[PDB]
Design a protein around this ligand. Structure first.
Ligand SMILES: C[S@@+](CC[C@H](N)C(=O)[O-])C[C@H]1O[C@@H](n2cnc3c(N)ncnc32)[C@H](O)[C@@H]1O
Ligand SMILES: C[S@@+](CC[C@H](N)C(=O)[O-])C[C@H]1O[C@@H](n2cnc3c(N)ncnc32)[C@H](O)[C@@H]1O
Lengths: 396, 396
């Protein structure tokens, strides 16, 4: 009875696989369809009622991965598939051997590790992937600061009878961390020991953001004299402008500034000075933009942290002050969420932001943000199959 | 390059599928292997680094399912696949339409719901499975009371430098719920509004526990006079003894008692009296077993809540007092965790128990529990491919 379903889902896996393996790098659409039919097959093998237990498996799995990562198990275990006993892991990390053995049961049956024998474990490339720069920056911060709040979205909205009371300073993050009134950045930066971990997470770029989407060379060159300036607003580490300076070196003596809050500027200031970009301490919620007439004010993965009102309009207004009507442009670089057919990649980013009062925006959402701030849309720049686009704006 | 891996994993999916579809109900081993190779295929399609993002997807997915379930979306949406708009769902549940739309992005791309159109959604059998009696009893309680603590296992053990400080009254549950000193049952039963939800979760039996594992007819019949008595200790709802009375009706006027704490006895007392079983208020940590010489003292899914010491030995000692040396036997009915090759089903149950100071036990773990309490093992009853067994004990 269930055998008939398994057989059909297997057929559709084989069909999507053959399609994927003979498309050309339609490759991304054939890849998502293959992934979707492969996931259907897992669910069909489990059946509806046992598959509803997957949430409880996923929770302990995440909990174990996070504990194993923070306790040094990933670092202690030998890379390349050589095996190691629970005793030796426990001896070198300090993690209780009894706990460790119980935790490994979540990450070996399918989990990214491999059970070589009784109390004997090995890395695979799926577990070593957590030691990689983007994962190692993103996963610890998410797991220590964001997963908790995300699970409490239900409790936050229950307090308001499932109405939207979420703000930037009153949200599942402030509930979980008991910091009502503090935005997420304020609370994290309060403890300087968090700044290095948090700035590294802001630098994580798993999707490898496409920076050649916009023509920086053509527009930055035509800027004469003082106009020839780019402001990376909340540019954090500066890698955004490093890419731009690497996409347009047919240049003049251009001014490249990266602005951010004081702790972030302090963490990166020397590395940034060293590549000829100047760091600036700036708060786009407390101050007007302190650089006038610049050719471009650039915003990458900043506006997904703030609702249209009040903060969204206040950022745009604070940099509206410094702009030239016909020589300055605002560039908003962020995910553009489709109105249909969004992926789990849209969903985990949007819903994690829901916890701190942010949101990933649709095209129509960007339209309101511009309208509400009295700006005209020059052009949306998107290279389809790219999640991000660049909203190019101007004073109208 | 990655195409070669996909192709091999597809081959192994097709191979395990053909094996599964021609085994006989080796069916369970062929079923787990098919599931494992199907899951490998998903991971291989994603690649190591993108698959490490699966924890963040799994977290928002669980968070959305829980919010959608608690807010009435599952109940409001039409069963059978008919579609419904975000507007109509919001109108009938009170859940903010904007939130709802963002939450549905976690549960339609693969999640159990179906995106029929823009802001248009339908049940599938995988989402309706959450309305089923076992899921509907288990998932809300887990999600409201247990998921939070599980994610804080890392924070609890960090406090002790990854040493095992977990007890029944000092654990990730007491940390998350800020109730140091209270065991999980004490804290939940404190609020009577939790008793009905919690007792229904204790009744959830997704795996459908095999009760014909032990020969109740043969042993209960030979008990003459006062010996002919079964005590379902922490029997809660009573379904355990309903099964036993349905596996052995070639009986005398046997005494069937279900013991449990006062709130649980109050919730079920009338239903239990109605089927000829007598409810008894009893606390196996504060009192000695108040029924003497009974043929069997039966413990189903109770000892996985308590460590060997102190509570494990104290339960056994408190019922040791009431036993007859050669006419009474203790039956421990619980999961038996293999020393190798455990599944995600072992792991989610064991690690969820870790949060409250419980644990699922191996065969060798049961041996210590018996030894430490001065008991001899008569026989382990296990029907392989059954996760549970029955540890039969006697005073030696
Ligand atoms: C998610 S990070 C994005 C950083 C960088 N543009 C990128 O894409 O990698 C958001 C940045 O905004 C900064 N930020 C938060 N609040 C700010 C404020 N009030 N004024 C200026 N920057 C702020 C944070 O310090 C952080 O570096
Ligand atoms: C996980 S339920 C298992 C119930 C039932 N035997 C079954 O398998 O469905 C554990 C039960 O132990 C009970 N319990 C917890 N602490 C107890 C105590 N100190 N004395 C007696 N019963 C207790 C709870 O009320 C709950 O009904």
């Amino acid at each position: 009875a269930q055998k008939i379903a398994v057989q059909k889902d297997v057929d559709e896996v084989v069909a999507a696989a053959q399609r994927f393996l003979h498309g050309s790098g339609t490759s991304d659409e054939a890849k998502v369809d293959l992934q979707k039919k492969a996931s259907n097959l897992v669910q069909t093998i489990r059946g509806p009622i046992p598959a509803a237990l997957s949430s409880m498996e996923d929770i302990v799995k995440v909990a174990s991965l996070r504990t194993l990562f923070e306790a040094g198990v990933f670092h202690a275990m030998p890379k390349g598939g050589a095996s190691m006993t629970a005793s030796e892991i426990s001896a070198q990390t300090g993690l209780d051997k009894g706990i460790l053995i119980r935790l490994m049961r979540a990450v070996t049956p399918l989990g990214p590790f491999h059970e070589v024998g009784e109390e004997e474990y090995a890395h695979t490339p799926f577990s070593e992937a957590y030691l990689t720069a983007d994962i190692a920056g993103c996963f610890p911060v998410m797991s220590n600061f964001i997963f908790g709040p995300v699970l409490q979205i239900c409790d936050f909205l229950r307090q308001n009878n499932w109405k939207d009371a979420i703000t930037t300073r009153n949200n599942p993050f402030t509930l979980a961390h008991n910091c009502p009134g503090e935005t997420m950045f304020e609370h994290l930066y309060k403890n300087s020991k968090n700044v290095a971990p948090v700035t590294k997470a802001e630098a994580a770029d798993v999707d490898q953001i496409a920076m050649d989407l916009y023509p920086w060379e053509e527009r930055l060159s035509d800027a004469k004299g003082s106009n020839a300036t780019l402001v990376d607003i909340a540019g954090s580490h500066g890698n955004g402008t490093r890419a731009i300076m690497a996409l347009a070196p047919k240049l003049n003596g251009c001014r490249f500034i990266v602005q951010d809050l004081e702790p972030v500027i302090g963490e990166h200031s020397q590395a940034l000075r060293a590549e000829g970009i100047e760091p600036q301490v700036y708060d786009f919620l407390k101050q007007e933009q302190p650089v006038h007439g610049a050719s471009i004010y650039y915003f990458r993965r900043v506006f997904h942290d703030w609702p249209d009102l009040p903060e969204g309009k206040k950022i745009l207004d604070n940099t509206r002050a410094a702009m030239s009507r016909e020589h300055s442009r605002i560039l908003i670089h962020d995910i553009i969420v489709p109105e249909i057919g969004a992926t789990m990649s849209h969903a985990w980013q949007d819903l994690s932001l829901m916890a701190i009062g942010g949101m990933e925006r649709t095209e129509k959402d960007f339209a309101r943000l511009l309208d509400i701030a009295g700006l005209a849309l020059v052009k949306v720049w998107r290279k389809p199959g790219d999640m991000m686009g660049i909203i190019e704006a101007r004073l109208k």
